[PDB]
Design a protein around this ligand. Sequence first.
Ligand SMILES: [Ca+2]
Ligand SMILES: [Cl-]
Length: 496
Amino acid sequence: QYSSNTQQGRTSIVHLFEWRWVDIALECERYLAPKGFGGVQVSPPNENVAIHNPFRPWWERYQPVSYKLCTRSGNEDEFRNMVTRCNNVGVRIYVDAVINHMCGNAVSAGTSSTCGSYFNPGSRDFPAVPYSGWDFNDGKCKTGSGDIENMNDATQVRDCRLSGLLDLALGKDYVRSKIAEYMNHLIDIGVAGFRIDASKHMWPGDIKAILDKLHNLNSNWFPEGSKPFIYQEVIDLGGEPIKSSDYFGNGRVTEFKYGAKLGTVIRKWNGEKMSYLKNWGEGWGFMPSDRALVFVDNHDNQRGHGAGGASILTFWDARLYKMAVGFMLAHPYGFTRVMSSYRWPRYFENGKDVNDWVGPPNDNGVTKEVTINPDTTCGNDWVCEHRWRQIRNMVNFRNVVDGQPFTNWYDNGSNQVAFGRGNRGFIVFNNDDWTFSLTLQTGLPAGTYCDVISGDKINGNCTGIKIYVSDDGKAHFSISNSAEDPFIAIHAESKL
Ligand SMILES: [Ca+2]
Ligand SMILES: [Cl-]
């Protein structure tokens, strides 16, 4: 469950948040494959409640109605078409598995659902599965409300309703079997793994019992005996009874400490600075590198949901965001996930975004296609961070330097730092309020290299900055503190 099942030479996943299946399919062929992306995390592909107050929020997709593959992203044929076309160009699909719960206990009964399936939350009736009152934790939960009230009590965190979400009885073989049925449907279609939603709210042993029922990966695209990549959403910032390590038996775990700390560092908050990043990883109290799923932001915290945090960097803070993403993709710690977002009309009232609910760009509820502008950015309010040159090129940097040791570290004791990845890549950051001008040991073979942050290599030359590495491995770097992108990155494939 620990292996990503990506192609050799591809090393990141991109979250194409709320994208339609037909658009992801095209994106795999036209962009993700030729740019060396490892795979795509998709939004939950199972049928959910259609919530009209507020108007079709992104979070409706975290309220299941059935396991029919029928959502605003598309239907089953569209989903299957996407997985096939992506696998055929060597780009994997990872499904956001919403398996802790069905929908909110106060949602009205009826057919207000993405495939029109009937459901009755009040009577715990989900006939499209089917689930009944017998399949929920109502009798197991010990709280007065029936909801989670106290996260210091690990039992209620697992057995009670997360914010009123009907809590599936995952201790029951029947429930485990219906969930495995859904996950096996997806595996056989050709998915490579799963982001396990709300993993903290499930017993590690119940997750184990479900994973025991899972097939090996589709044997047309994957070597015999391949296991689904599992990464579990567990928010563990310390000081709680439940720990990320409790989930290591099932797969990788999201390291939410990563983005929280990196955001603080890059913002230069809390007395933190880039020179402190020399021992980034377990040295900062993080989980083992071989278990961490890392990211700067995710779909929750980029809008103040989840554990939120003021320090989180997002596309809204584009300059600092590119630096944080660049550092993450250059550094060997963890398995990397790049966020890809949509714009929404952010509006702050008494500290919070009152539009943090807004779903994807839509025409009266119908998700808008991703249009591609002539400059390769996206239209229709899709942000497409993964298409930003500075991020896309760092995704390839990580591929090129895969397996190479963290080496040749430099810092000025403040916010001017640099490091190499063996003899394959070198990166330089200036986050101080003065110019960084210095000759540094790069560890690289002598030659002329395109800076992949300011430009591209296009057979024979560079469209941005050129760096000249002398016979002894040294090169001069000049970065103004006023630079739009105050970092430079070079690697073996950017050499002329
Ligand atoms: Ca639960
Ligand atoms: Cl996540």
